[PDB]
Amino acid sequence: LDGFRKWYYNAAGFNKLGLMRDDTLHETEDVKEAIRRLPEDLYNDRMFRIKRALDLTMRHQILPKDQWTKYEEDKFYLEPYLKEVIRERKEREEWAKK
Amino acid sequence: KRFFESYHEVPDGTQCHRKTYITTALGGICGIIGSAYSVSLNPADSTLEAVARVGRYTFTAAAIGAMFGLTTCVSAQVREKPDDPLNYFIGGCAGGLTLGARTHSYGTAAMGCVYMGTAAALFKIGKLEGWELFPTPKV
Amino acid sequence: HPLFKIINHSFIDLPAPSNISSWWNFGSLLGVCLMVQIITGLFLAMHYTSDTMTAFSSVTHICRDVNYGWLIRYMHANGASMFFICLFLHVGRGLYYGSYTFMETWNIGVLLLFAVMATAFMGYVLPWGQMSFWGATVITNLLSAIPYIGTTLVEWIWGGFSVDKATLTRFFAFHFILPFIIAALAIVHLLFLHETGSNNPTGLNSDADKIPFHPYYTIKDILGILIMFLILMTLVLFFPDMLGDPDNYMPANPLNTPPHIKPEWYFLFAYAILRSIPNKLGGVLALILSILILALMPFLHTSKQRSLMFRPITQILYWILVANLLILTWIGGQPVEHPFIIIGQLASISYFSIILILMPISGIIEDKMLKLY
Amino acid sequence: HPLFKIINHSFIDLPAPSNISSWWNFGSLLGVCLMVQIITGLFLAMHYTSDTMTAFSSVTHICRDVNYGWLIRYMHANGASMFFICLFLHVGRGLYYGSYTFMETWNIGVLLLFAVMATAFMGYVLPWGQMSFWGATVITNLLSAIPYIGTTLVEWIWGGFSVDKATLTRFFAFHFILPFIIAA
Amino acid sequence: LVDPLTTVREHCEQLEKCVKARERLELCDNRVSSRSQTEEDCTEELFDFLHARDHCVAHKLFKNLK
Amino acid sequence: EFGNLARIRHVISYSLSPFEQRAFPSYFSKGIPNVLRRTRERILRVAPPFVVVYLIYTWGNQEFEQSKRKNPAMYE
Amino acid sequence: AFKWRGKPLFVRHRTKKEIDQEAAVEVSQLRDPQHDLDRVKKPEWVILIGVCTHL
Amino acid sequence: SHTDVKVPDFSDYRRAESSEAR
Amino acid sequence: PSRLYSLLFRRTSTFALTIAVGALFFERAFDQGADAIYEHINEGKLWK
Amino acid sequence: LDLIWLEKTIPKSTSTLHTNMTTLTTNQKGLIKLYFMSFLINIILIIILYSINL
Amino acid sequence: LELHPPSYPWSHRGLLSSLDHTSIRRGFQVYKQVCSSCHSMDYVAYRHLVGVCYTEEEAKALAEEVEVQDGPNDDGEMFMRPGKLSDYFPKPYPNPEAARAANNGALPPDLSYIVRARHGGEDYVFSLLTGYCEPPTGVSLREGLYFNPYFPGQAIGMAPPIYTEVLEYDDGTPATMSQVAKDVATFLRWASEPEHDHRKRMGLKMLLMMGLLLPLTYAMKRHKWSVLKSRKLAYRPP
Amino acid sequence: GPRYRELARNWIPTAGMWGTVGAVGLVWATDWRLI
Ligand code: HEM
Ligand code: HEM
Ligand code: HEM
């Protein structure tokens, strides 16, 4: 399962643009709240990675293979911050039903 | 066995479906046999690993069976010339290419294309000229 | 200046994503095609007569006696075909790249698609050939499906017991008036989009990389317009009758019926579905759903990634969907006999199961593979 | 909704002067008249034929055989008359109260006035009566006055040596298409 | 005067592909002769034979034609 | 509009004037490799489906004809 | 047919056999239960409207 | 600071008195 | 040639004049050249 | 074309094709079980070769 | 189930290949002497010929060679006059039924757009006119029928109208059945598309103009898009 | 949940009234005699 997940990570292809997994999340309301709660350096790296991926997609290029994002290396930075947004979101919801 | 033979009965370039199916089976059969020898000797490390190898060899062989069948049939279809070693060569040409890909090597595709295609072409000629293989002793 | 303010806002200083491919040209092409159709339609309207005695005679008079009237007529017909080509590729771009999450833009789109299909149907009825008359009857009797409301409604459109002059004239009036409603709905389509901006093929937030539109996506739209004009003209001036049907060059005979009747290419996928369902009503409904399933599409998105650039399993399912859409287009053409029917039945089952069931399950699986679910 | 904003920006929360008289109604009436004309025109277009053999016959068929077709036809004609009454009173309001200092609004207005006059002229040509044909020839002849390119222009519009079917059909197309340009 | 078609036809016609086709038709013709009391016809055989013949003739009638 | 679209920081961006740079730098030099790079990246996810389409198409056509073909035993 | 009311007005005459088979047809087993005579005042004479119930 | 690096090379882009022609 | 830029491309007005004038003559040349081709391609078949 | 392309294709390739083929066929554990099982496979295939061509 | 006419190497089959106008003239002669007795080229008028294969005055001659009635006269209905260049070709059987009767129930289909209205018309036409072969075993055509493998049902009321040397070509080209079927297929084709030639000239000019304009517009786009396509981004966190 | 249930129970009576109006409206407009 670990090797097949690495093979699917190579087949997804966002590592060839230098992106992380959390860069590829669709910005819903909860995702934008999690992005807003990021520290400044992580937010700046995320915006630069997104801009570089957009530029590479503009020129129809990819990064060189040494510059790709290694599956093992990818960091799920937004995840911790996101869970909270969802948790808080759900809590408010249940309370609504009260 | 009446099955495989069917491939030859219908004129080439026609009923590609049957052709591709038959060719795919033969390749696959060879895949099994080939994997078997490959597993019996040079054994694997774990049963699963070997089951995988059987699969790999089987599929690769099945593929080289399909494309051969498909390319040759279609080449004949499109070209409209049923009897021509070239049809088969294009087919063998393709078959080799699949092998090359499965092995992830352009070079293999090279030798594969030439050698494999040539062989298939010779099969066509063989059938066209009624060459006899493994003949009974008639002295 | 008030106007220039508006002008600068939708076409010059509009912030567009820098990385949108050639597929994003297609919608602008559709607008150009709309104007082209309207312009050619206006120059067909100065000589066409919507009378059943004189409609075929007026069309032949356009082709034979009006200076370059054959050019304007075949430009109109092949421009309708080019409109549907660009429409299908626009809808396919919207399905592939997750652009249906712009829900209001998507719903105004599917309204525009319904209006364009109705306009093209009545326009094809307009020359009053053999094929037009039997096509109208057939497609209209389809409306006769509804049990209590349907029958009367049909003759209401037919304006009589059976399609006859009553229909032709009101079909000329509708077919004239609906492309202006299409233009107004396209203005609403553009508005509901600028509020959100266009999407990019990566599906990510492109706010960090946006460029102007005047010098970057204008010359690109001009190049796409030039290529689309190359394909249209080379489909009018060299292969003018390729997309049409020969039986439409016979006059409309109510006593005879063209032996082999088929909708034009674009309406076939639907035709196949209709024929597939055994029940008449079922067919009509499925047919409608065929188009409507798209509207339903923004509620079926279960993935955390907007686009399919990084989603290979749903890419495979998407290309299987394009594949059996082409299969349904072929089947419609084929006559009623084995095994065309079974393929049609399966192809329709596979179409509805891929759009309804397989893509959200695949998106859940893809989210599970990235340790997100 | 983004679309709702437009409504609340032009019809609900629009700050209007509290003391404008009934004359300021008239422009809105013109818009209503435009819709009315378009609607009635659409229901004339489902039975009218723009052929010189059949145009008068189609108009009589509308008046005599279509259910309430006389109602829609005379509503269209008297709605054109009501359109010009409201147009003249709108222009008179603009002249009297100094509203022409809104210069862009005034110029778009006089463009609309030219378009409405052309639409009504070709619409009056459309029933192909005695009066329509001689009226058309007359004004089309007006163009011939042009110093150098007049003759050509007249013949162009007529689409032939003299107004005949060629004209009627293109006048039907132009009379159909111009009220949508008037709406824009 | 000899219609060029006749010539071209003769040529393509002489071809065996076609000859045997005709023969198959012949067997069919004969079948219907003996099997005279039936509804089986030779229309299908007729068409396939012709398709071949014409295709070839068509390949080569316009050249002769002037 | 521009100016209020997004917030980035420390991302320097260099560029050149159009007339100062070659119009088609290495157009076929790298274009071909790239186009080829691209196809191999999606070919396995695009063609396979349509291949089967060609197949169904063919099988379908042939099968129909056979259905039309007269049954030998028929009438005999 | 005489195109009555803008639709083909099929008017047909039937043979002894023709009339004989139609009666033989199973009315109940018919998709639409309407015995041949049920739609004809004369067995030798059948009159129908030519619009396929379907489309 | 702002002087640590120099403008990247555009030689594969840059073309090879000329402005007027260019 | 730097005379071009100075005489034709430099001032928008001049840039235009050259376009319009060229287009005025281009039609003559294009039509003539094109017709020559079309005809020859089918030299035999045409009224004369 | 001389040296590399006409030496890599005909003279050298045939050198490699074989070299590689000997490497797989001659890399044998030396264990009897493996070898023997291959005898098993053979008996099976020959049994079939006769069977299918009965 | 129908025989599918083969592809013939027509002189207008090519992408820029126009029609052979001598063949259109010969096919018009074939229609005038044979096909005009039953079929009606309603949408082709003598004037149409001028410019294709007959000159103005020449056409006038043909026009003057037919009697066309003028319905409205001070007190009369018809003193068919010398047909003019504005008169349309004379349709036989003024009423459809008339022909129905004459052709035994069949209604020759107006051959103005026959080639356009028949799938693979040019071929079909040629095939039908030349496909009058022997009926096979088991076939039982109804009274007044003939056997053509192509015609739908293979039962065309039209009897075979082209017997070798049916008419003599004024040009003298041997009037073999085929030479006549090819000429009338070219003519009917012309009839169904009098603009075939003019268009192809427009298409040639369009291909030349697009071959000039597509790389130039591509070069302008790649100029205005080079700026970005060379943009180098660098992230320099402080 | 419970709150939304209260909301539904509280608005459904109003909703039924609205439907009632529509019934009268549709029927009157359709002039469906069955009603
Ligand atoms: C009348 C035919 C249509 C025209 C002229 C048209 C035109 C356009 C244009 C110009 C755009 C802006 C995108 C661009 O050009 O780059 C656009 C966007 C869009 N259209 Fe369409 N469209 C049409 C039909 C449809 C239909 C039928 C749908 C729904 C299936 C649809 C859905 C969308 C969506 C979702 C977008 C936003 C996608 C994006 O810009 O990223 N459109 N359309
Ligand atoms: C206001 C805009 C439009 C006008 C005034 C217009 C006018 C006309 C007229 C008068 C005809 C009959 C003449 C003929 O068929 O040769 C016609 C035919 C047709 N129109 Fe339109 N049209 C318009 C827009 C459209 C649009 C948007 C479509 C596509 C949806 C369309 C598709 C067709 C088609 C398919 C035909 C029949 C072509 C044929 O005869 O083969 N038209 N149009
Ligand atoms: C697009 C909208 C419109 C359509 C489709 C339309 C259509 C028609 C048609 C079919 C007729 C001939 C039947 C008749 O005699 O009334 C007609 C006549 C006429 N239309 Fe219009 N029309 C439109 C808008 C207008 C407008 C805005 C005006 C006023 C400026 C106008 C003024 C007239 C007049 C004066 C006549 C002649 C009435 C008469 O017969 O005495 N129409 N129109």
Short mmCIF file of N, CA and C and ligand atoms in Angstrom, two decimals, chain C residues 177, chain D residues 33-34 37-46 48 59 62 72-74 76-81 83-84 115-117 119-128 132 172 175-180 182, ligand 3:
data_model
loop_
_atom_site.label_atom_id
_atom_site.label_comp_id
_atom_site.label_asym_id
_atom_site.label_seq_id
_atom_site.Cartn_x
_atom_site.Cartn_y
_atom_site.Cartn_z
N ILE C 177 -36.46 35.00 -33.02
CA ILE C 177 -36.42 35.80 -31.80
C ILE C 177 -35.50 35.20 -30.72
N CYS D 33 -44.39 50.40 -23.63
CA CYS D 33 -44.91 50.38 -24.99
C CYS D 33 -44.01 49.57 -25.89
N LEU D 34 -42.68 49.69 -25.67
CA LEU D 34 -41.71 48.92 -26.43
C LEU D 34 -41.93 47.43 -26.24
N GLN D 37 -45.15 46.42 -27.90
CA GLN D 37 -44.98 46.34 -29.35
C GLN D 37 -44.28 45.06 -29.72
N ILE D 38 -43.22 44.73 -28.97
CA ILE D 38 -42.42 43.53 -29.24
C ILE D 38 -43.29 42.30 -29.08
N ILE D 39 -44.09 42.28 -28.00
CA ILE D 39 -44.94 41.12 -27.73
C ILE D 39 -45.98 40.98 -28.81
N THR D 40 -46.63 42.10 -29.18
CA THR D 40 -47.65 42.04 -30.21
C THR D 40 -47.01 41.74 -31.55
N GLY D 41 -45.80 42.27 -31.76
CA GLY D 41 -45.10 42.02 -33.00
C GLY D 41 -44.74 40.56 -33.14
N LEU D 42 -44.38 39.92 -32.02
CA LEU D 42 -44.06 38.50 -32.07
C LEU D 42 -45.30 37.69 -32.43
N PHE D 43 -46.45 38.10 -31.91
CA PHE D 43 -47.66 37.38 -32.25
C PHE D 43 -48.22 37.80 -33.59
N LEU D 44 -47.69 38.86 -34.21
CA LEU D 44 -47.98 39.04 -35.62
C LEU D 44 -47.04 38.21 -36.49
N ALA D 45 -45.86 37.87 -35.97
CA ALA D 45 -44.86 37.22 -36.80
C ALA D 45 -45.11 35.73 -36.97
N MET D 46 -45.97 35.14 -36.15
CA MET D 46 -46.30 33.73 -36.27
C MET D 46 -47.29 33.44 -37.38
N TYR D 48 -47.72 36.21 -40.17
CA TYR D 48 -47.43 37.10 -41.29
C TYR D 48 -46.43 36.46 -42.24
N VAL D 59 -52.36 39.33 -43.67
CA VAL D 59 -52.91 40.31 -42.74
C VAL D 59 -54.41 40.13 -42.57
N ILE D 62 -54.97 37.09 -40.47
CA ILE D 62 -54.77 37.44 -39.06
C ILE D 62 -56.03 38.09 -38.50
N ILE D 72 -54.71 41.70 -31.63
CA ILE D 72 -53.25 41.86 -31.57
C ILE D 72 -52.76 42.81 -32.66
N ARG D 73 -53.37 42.75 -33.86
CA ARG D 73 -52.95 43.65 -34.93
C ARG D 73 -53.28 45.10 -34.62
N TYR D 74 -54.50 45.38 -34.17
CA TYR D 74 -54.85 46.76 -33.88
C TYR D 74 -54.20 47.26 -32.60
N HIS D 76 -51.10 46.40 -31.97
CA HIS D 76 -49.78 46.75 -32.50
C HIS D 76 -49.78 48.12 -33.18
N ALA D 77 -50.80 48.39 -34.01
CA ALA D 77 -50.87 49.67 -34.73
C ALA D 77 -51.11 50.84 -33.78
N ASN D 78 -52.11 50.72 -32.90
CA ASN D 78 -52.37 51.80 -31.96
C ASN D 78 -51.31 51.88 -30.87
N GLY D 79 -50.55 50.81 -30.63
CA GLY D 79 -49.42 50.90 -29.74
C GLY D 79 -48.24 51.61 -30.35
N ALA D 80 -48.08 51.51 -31.67
CA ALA D 80 -47.11 52.37 -32.36
C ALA D 80 -47.51 53.84 -32.25
N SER D 81 -48.80 54.12 -32.40
CA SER D 81 -49.29 55.50 -32.23
C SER D 81 -49.10 55.99 -30.79
N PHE D 83 -46.82 54.86 -28.73
CA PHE D 83 -45.37 55.01 -28.62
C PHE D 83 -44.94 56.39 -29.09
N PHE D 84 -45.49 56.86 -30.21
CA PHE D 84 -45.08 58.17 -30.69
C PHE D 84 -45.67 59.31 -29.87
N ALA D 115 -34.00 55.61 -34.56
CA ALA D 115 -34.25 54.18 -34.72
C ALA D 115 -35.74 53.85 -34.67
N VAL D 116 -36.48 54.51 -33.78
CA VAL D 116 -37.92 54.27 -33.65
C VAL D 116 -38.66 54.76 -34.89
N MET D 117 -38.26 55.91 -35.44
CA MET D 117 -38.89 56.40 -36.67
C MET D 117 -38.63 55.47 -37.85
N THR D 119 -38.00 52.21 -37.65
CA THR D 119 -38.76 51.00 -37.36
C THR D 119 -40.24 51.17 -37.70
N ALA D 120 -40.82 52.31 -37.34
CA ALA D 120 -42.24 52.55 -37.62
C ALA D 120 -42.49 52.72 -39.11
N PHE D 121 -41.56 53.35 -39.84
CA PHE D 121 -41.70 53.49 -41.28
C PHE D 121 -41.72 52.14 -41.99
N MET D 122 -40.75 51.28 -41.67
CA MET D 122 -40.71 49.97 -42.33
C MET D 122 -41.87 49.08 -41.87
N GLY D 123 -42.31 49.23 -40.62
CA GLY D 123 -43.48 48.51 -40.16
C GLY D 123 -44.74 48.93 -40.89
N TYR D 124 -44.88 50.23 -41.18
CA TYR D 124 -46.03 50.67 -41.95
C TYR D 124 -45.95 50.21 -43.40
N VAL D 125 -44.74 50.03 -43.93
CA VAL D 125 -44.61 49.43 -45.26
C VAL D 125 -45.07 47.96 -45.25
N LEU D 126 -44.85 47.27 -44.12
CA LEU D 126 -45.06 45.81 -44.05
C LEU D 126 -46.43 45.24 -44.45
N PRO D 127 -47.60 45.83 -44.14
CA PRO D 127 -48.86 45.19 -44.58
C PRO D 127 -49.10 45.19 -46.08
N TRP D 128 -48.29 45.92 -46.87
CA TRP D 128 -48.33 45.93 -48.34
C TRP D 128 -49.69 46.35 -48.88
N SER D 132 -49.07 51.84 -48.16
CA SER D 132 -47.74 51.40 -47.76
C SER D 132 -46.76 51.45 -48.93
N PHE D 172 -39.17 43.50 -43.69
CA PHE D 172 -39.62 42.62 -42.61
C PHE D 172 -38.48 42.23 -41.69
N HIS D 175 -37.39 45.51 -39.75
CA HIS D 175 -38.42 45.86 -38.79
C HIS D 175 -38.48 44.85 -37.65
N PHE D 176 -38.12 43.60 -37.91
CA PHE D 176 -38.04 42.63 -36.83
C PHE D 176 -36.86 42.96 -35.93
N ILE D 177 -35.70 43.28 -36.53
CA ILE D 177 -34.47 43.26 -35.74
C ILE D 177 -34.23 44.59 -35.00
N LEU D 178 -34.71 45.73 -35.50
CA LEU D 178 -34.40 47.00 -34.85
C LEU D 178 -34.97 47.25 -33.45
N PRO D 179 -36.17 46.79 -33.04
CA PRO D 179 -36.58 47.03 -31.64
C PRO D 179 -35.70 46.37 -30.58
N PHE D 180 -34.96 45.31 -30.90
CA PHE D 180 -34.01 44.78 -29.93
C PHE D 180 -32.78 45.68 -29.78
N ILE D 182 -33.11 48.85 -30.21
CA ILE D 182 -33.74 49.93 -29.45
C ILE D 182 -33.75 49.61 -27.96
C1 HEM M 3 -39.56 43.07 -32.65
C2 HEM M 3 -40.75 43.61 -32.40
C3 HEM M 3 -41.72 43.78 -33.50
C4 HEM M 3 -42.20 42.82 -34.33
C5 HEM M 3 -41.86 41.35 -34.32
C6 HEM M 3 -43.11 43.46 -35.21
C7 HEM M 3 -43.78 42.74 -36.20
C8 HEM M 3 -44.68 43.34 -37.04
C9 HEM M 3 -45.40 42.67 -38.03
C10 HEM M 3 -45.31 41.20 -38.35
C11 HEM M 3 -46.19 43.57 -38.65
C12 HEM M 3 -47.12 43.27 -39.79
C13 HEM M 3 -48.54 43.05 -39.28
C14 HEM M 3 -49.19 44.40 -39.11
O1 HEM M 3 -49.63 45.00 -40.10
O2 HEM M 3 -49.26 44.91 -37.97
C15 HEM M 3 -45.96 44.82 -38.04
C16 HEM M 3 -46.59 45.99 -38.41
C17 HEM M 3 -46.32 47.19 -37.77
N1 HEM M 3 -45.46 47.45 -36.78
FE1 HEM M 3 -44.37 46.18 -35.95
N2 HEM M 3 -43.17 44.77 -34.94
C18 HEM M 3 -42.36 45.04 -33.91
C19 HEM M 3 -42.09 46.24 -33.26
C20 HEM M 3 -42.69 47.43 -33.63
C21 HEM M 3 -42.48 48.66 -33.00
C22 HEM M 3 -41.55 48.92 -31.84
C23 HEM M 3 -43.26 49.59 -33.65
C24 HEM M 3 -43.35 51.02 -33.32
C25 HEM M 3 -42.28 51.80 -33.49
C26 HEM M 3 -43.97 48.91 -34.67
C27 HEM M 3 -44.86 49.50 -35.54
C28 HEM M 3 -45.55 48.75 -36.49
C29 HEM M 3 -46.54 49.38 -37.37
C30 HEM M 3 -46.94 50.83 -37.37
C31 HEM M 3 -47.02 48.41 -38.16
C32 HEM M 3 -48.07 48.55 -39.23
C33 HEM M 3 -49.44 48.47 -38.56
C34 HEM M 3 -50.54 48.41 -39.59
O3 HEM M 3 -50.68 47.38 -40.29
O4 HEM M 3 -51.32 49.37 -39.74
N3 HEM M 3 -43.60 47.60 -34.63
N4 HEM M 3 -45.03 44.66 -37.04
#
